[PDB]
Design an enzyme around this catalytic site. Sequence first.
Site, PDB file in Angstrom:
ATOM      1  N   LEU A 296      -5.699 -25.677   0.921  1.00  0.00           N
ATOM      2  CA  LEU A 296      -5.704 -24.299   0.680  1.00  0.00           C
ATOM      3  C   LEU A 296      -5.099 -23.580  -0.682  1.00  0.00           C
ATOM      4  CD1 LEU A 296      -4.942 -22.800   4.411  1.00  0.00           C
ATOM      5  CD2 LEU A 296      -7.248 -23.281   3.164  1.00  0.00           C
TER       6      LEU A 296
ATOM      7  N   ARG B 293       6.427   0.299  15.124  1.00  0.00           N
ATOM      8  CA  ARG B 293       5.059   0.447  14.731  1.00  0.00           C
ATOM      9  C   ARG B 293       4.615   1.894  15.381  1.00  0.00           C
ATOM     10  NH1 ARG B 293       3.199  -2.812  11.539  1.00  0.00           N
ATOM     11  NH2 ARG B 293       1.125  -2.563  12.486  1.00  0.00           N
TER      12      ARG B 293
ATOM     13  N   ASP C   6      -0.365   6.627   5.222  1.00  0.00           N
ATOM     14  CA  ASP C   6      -0.652   6.827   3.647  1.00  0.00           C
ATOM     15  C   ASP C   6      -1.958   7.649   3.765  1.00  0.00           C
ATOM     16  OD1 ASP C   6       1.172   4.761   2.900  1.00  0.00           O
ATOM     17  OD2 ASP C   6      -0.050   3.205   4.024  1.00  0.00           O
TER      18      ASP C   6
ATOM     19  N   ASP D   3       3.053   2.893   8.866  1.00  0.00           N
ATOM     20  CA  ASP D   3       3.366   4.046   8.165  1.00  0.00           C
ATOM     21  C   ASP D   3       1.928   4.948   8.002  1.00  0.00           C
ATOM     22  OD1 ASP D   3       2.241   3.247   5.918  1.00  0.00           O
ATOM     23  OD2 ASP D   3       4.179   3.654   4.628  1.00  0.00           O
TER      24      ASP D   3
ATOM     25  N   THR E  99      18.855  -5.006   3.739  1.00  0.00           N
ATOM     26  CA  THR E  99      17.489  -4.765   2.961  1.00  0.00           C
ATOM     27  C   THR E  99      16.399  -4.095   4.036  1.00  0.00           C
ATOM     28  OG1 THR E  99      16.356  -6.800   3.150  1.00  0.00           O
ATOM     29  CG2 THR E  99      17.925  -6.316   1.311  1.00  0.00           C
TER      30      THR E  99
ATOM     31  N   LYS F  44       7.136 -28.768   3.936  1.00  0.00           N
ATOM     32  CA  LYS F  44       7.800 -27.547   4.873  1.00  0.00           C
ATOM     33  C   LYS F  44       7.040 -27.659   6.254  1.00  0.00           C
ATOM     34  CE  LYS F  44      11.032 -25.095   1.963  1.00  0.00           C
ATOM     35  NZ  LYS F  44      10.969 -26.016   0.877  1.00  0.00           N
TER      36      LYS F  44
ATOM     37  N   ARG G 146      -8.360   0.334   7.287  1.00  0.00           N
ATOM     38  CA  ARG G 146      -8.623  -0.915   7.444  1.00  0.00           C
ATOM     39  C   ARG G 146      -8.975  -1.025   8.897  1.00  0.00           C
ATOM     40  NH1 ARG G 146      -3.906  -2.296   4.133  1.00  0.00           N
ATOM     41  NH2 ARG G 146      -3.280  -4.013   5.970  1.00  0.00           N
TER      42      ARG G 146
ATOM     43  N   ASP H  50       3.682   8.529   3.076  1.00  0.00           N
ATOM     44  CA  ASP H  50       3.590   8.706   1.542  1.00  0.00           C
ATOM     45  C   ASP H  50       2.184   9.399   1.265  1.00  0.00           C
ATOM     46  OD1 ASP H  50       5.780   6.831   1.338  1.00  0.00           O
ATOM     47  OD2 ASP H  50       4.386   5.072   1.685  1.00  0.00           O
TER      48      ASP H  50
HETATM   49  C1  LIG Z   1       3.545  -2.175  -0.681  1.00  0.00           C
HETATM   50  C2  LIG Z   1       2.330  -2.525  -1.586  1.00  0.00           C
HETATM   51  C3  LIG Z   1       1.385  -1.443  -1.399  1.00  0.00           C
HETATM   52  N1  LIG Z   1       0.022  -1.166  -2.054  1.00  0.00           N
HETATM   53  C4  LIG Z   1      -0.898  -0.565  -1.682  1.00  0.00           C
HETATM   54  C5  LIG Z   1      -1.828  -1.201  -0.861  1.00  0.00           C
HETATM   55  C6  LIG Z   1      -1.374  -0.765   0.559  1.00  0.00           C
HETATM   56  O1  LIG Z   1      -2.314  -1.012   1.693  1.00  0.00           O
HETATM   57  C7  LIG Z   1      -1.115   0.766   0.129  1.00  0.00           C
HETATM   58  C8  LIG Z   1      -0.136   1.464   1.236  1.00  0.00           C
HETATM   59  O2  LIG Z   1       1.026   0.822   1.213  1.00  0.00           O
HETATM   60  P1  LIG Z   1       1.636   0.136   2.879  1.00  0.00           P
HETATM   61  O3  LIG Z   1       3.084  -0.545   2.496  1.00  0.00           O
HETATM   62  O4  LIG Z   1       1.964   1.520   3.506  1.00  0.00           O
HETATM   63  O5  LIG Z   1       0.678  -0.762   3.192  1.00  0.00           O
HETATM   64  P2  LIG Z   1      -0.138  -0.915   4.514  1.00  0.00           P
HETATM   65  O6  LIG Z   1      -1.336  -1.577   4.157  1.00  0.00           O
HETATM   66  O7  LIG Z   1      -0.547   0.217   5.053  1.00  0.00           O
HETATM   67  C9  LIG Z   1       0.710  -1.786   5.850  1.00  0.00           C
HETATM   68 CL1  LIG Z   1      -0.222  -3.098   6.653  1.00  0.00          CL
HETATM   69 CL2  LIG Z   1       2.257  -2.815   5.119  1.00  0.00          CL
HETATM   70  P3  LIG Z   1       1.483  -0.625   6.924  1.00  0.00           P
HETATM   71  O8  LIG Z   1       1.995   0.473   6.209  1.00  0.00           O
HETATM   72  O9  LIG Z   1       0.394  -0.191   7.897  1.00  0.00           O
HETATM   73  O10 LIG Z   1       2.771  -1.429   7.658  1.00  0.00           O
HETATM   74  O11 LIG Z   1      -0.421   0.660  -0.915  1.00  0.00           O
HETATM   75  C10 LIG Z   1      -0.086  -2.246  -3.347  1.00  0.00           C
HETATM   76  O12 LIG Z   1      -0.967  -2.072  -3.761  1.00  0.00           O
HETATM   77  N2  LIG Z   1       1.142  -2.812  -3.462  1.00  0.00           N
HETATM   78  C11 LIG Z   1       2.144  -2.949  -2.917  1.00  0.00           C
HETATM   79  O13 LIG Z   1       3.061  -3.718  -3.326  1.00  0.00           O
HETATM   80 MG   LIG Z   2       0.907   1.924   5.166  1.00  0.00          MG
HETATM   81 NA    NA Z   3      15.079  -1.983   2.134  1.00  0.00          NA
HETATM   82 NA    NA Z   4      -3.511 -25.747  -2.552  1.00  0.00          NA
HETATM   83 NA    NA Z   5       2.974   3.634   2.726  1.00  0.00          NA
END
Ligand SMILES: Cc1cn([C@H]2C[C@H](O)[C@@H](COP(=O)(O)OP(=O)(O)C(Cl)(Cl)P(=O)(O)O)O2)c(=O)[nH]c1=O
Ligand SMILES: [Mg+2]
Ligand code: NA
Ligand code: NA
Ligand code: NA
EC number: 2.7.7.7
Length: 326
Positions: free
Chosen positions: A53, A140, A183, A181, A92, A63, A174, A247
């Site tokens: 891959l 979650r 967005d 969170d 962290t 690993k 998606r 956010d």
């Molecule tokens: C962190 C990060 C985000 N995004 C874009 C793409 C990301 O989709 C968008 C929202 O960031 P979020 O951290 O909320 O990511 P989610 O997909 O919503 C998730 Cl599965 Cl981790 P959860 O929040 O549901 O737990 O911002 C980026 O482009 N680069 C990055 O480094």
């Molecule tokens: Mg998010």
């Molecule tokens: Na942190």
């Molecule tokens: Na590879």
């Molecule tokens: Na976010």
Amino acid sequence: TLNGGITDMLTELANFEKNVSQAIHKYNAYRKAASVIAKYPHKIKSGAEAKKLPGVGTKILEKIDEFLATGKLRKLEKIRQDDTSSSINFLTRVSGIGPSAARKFVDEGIKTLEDLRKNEDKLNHHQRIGLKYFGDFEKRIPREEMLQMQDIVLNEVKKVDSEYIATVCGSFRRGAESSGDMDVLLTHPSFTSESTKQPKLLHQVVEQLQKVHFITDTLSKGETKFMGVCQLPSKNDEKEYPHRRIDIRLIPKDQYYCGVLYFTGSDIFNKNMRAHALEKGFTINEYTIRPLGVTGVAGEPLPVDSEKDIFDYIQWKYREPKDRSE
DNA sequence: CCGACAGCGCATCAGC
DNA sequence: GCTGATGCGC
DNA sequence: GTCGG
Ligand SMILES: Cc1cn([C@H]2C[C@H](O)[C@@H](COP(=O)(O)OP(=O)(O)C(Cl)(Cl)P(=O)(O)O)O2)c(=O)[nH]c1=O
Ligand SMILES: [Mg+2]
Ligand code: NA
Ligand code: NA
Ligand code: NA
Ligand SMILES: [Cl-]
Ligand SMILES: [Cl-]
């Protein structure tokens, strides 16, 4: 879940490299390997099989061979036993404490949740709110809750100005059955790449959500990005809902499609897509897709009228949001 | 071998 | 205060 | 840590 043992191992290695080693490229390499293996539709039987891959090289192959033979990784077993690495990794997990603050706190004897609580004056505002909701921010969000949150946010935004358009992105867009969170992409016709006819466009929305007690805390805020805390209202005698991270990103309305592609993610999908754009001679951010000259300097924004237009430029078949969970 | 690895908003700090 | 670098988190 | 040139 098909290769959940391996991908958990790689994620823990990634976290170690980011948080303890402060080795950001190893962190991204492990995350890329975990992503490609999570997507691989066969139960991996050997490191050699995984090395085929893209993003799995010799080191991760070895690993994987150890993990398959023994069910564990000695490297990670020692990391778990190391008080200093375990302490840094834990800190962290507080929002706003990254690898550098984590190591600063550990160096001065601040190593546990209580140490932080009894040392609240060593924390900046973001860290203070992250500590306050530490337990909540580990939970979650069920998609049914995301739907109620969406209803509140869109309706309250509509009450401020009917010309706002708020779009919930992230894993929710998606199609995920749960999200970490919420967005929210925000647009208004007054704010375009050509002009800002109206001030406080974001502030007014935030203010309204605070007024109805949906937004409860602020982590950071500027003219185009708000990051904070919200809570669904509960019913009589009902236990409260957890507080949730929210956010909000105000994007020029004529750049909606680049903004919604960005905010829908995933983050690894965006990295893959943006890397592929660079190979095709374009650069993509949340605002525009631009061509690169022979100098590698970004030219002028190309016209974009759909998410698919962006994919077309880089010669990718269109991928629906639900197939961007990388 | 080795340069590149996605891209950027906001908070904070150093130096002036 | 302004500017630039760094941290953190999307 | 991995890989394209
Ligand atoms: C962190 C990060 C985000 N995004 C874009 C793409 C990301 O989709 C968008 C929202 O960031 P979020 O951290 O909320 O990511 P989610 O997909 O919503 C998730 Cl599965 Cl981790 P959860 O929040 O549901 O737990 O911002 C980026 O482009 N680069 C990055 O480094
Ligand atoms: Mg998010
Ligand atoms: Na942190
Ligand atoms: Na590879
Ligand atoms: Na976010
Ligand atoms: Cl590194
Ligand atoms: Cl731009």
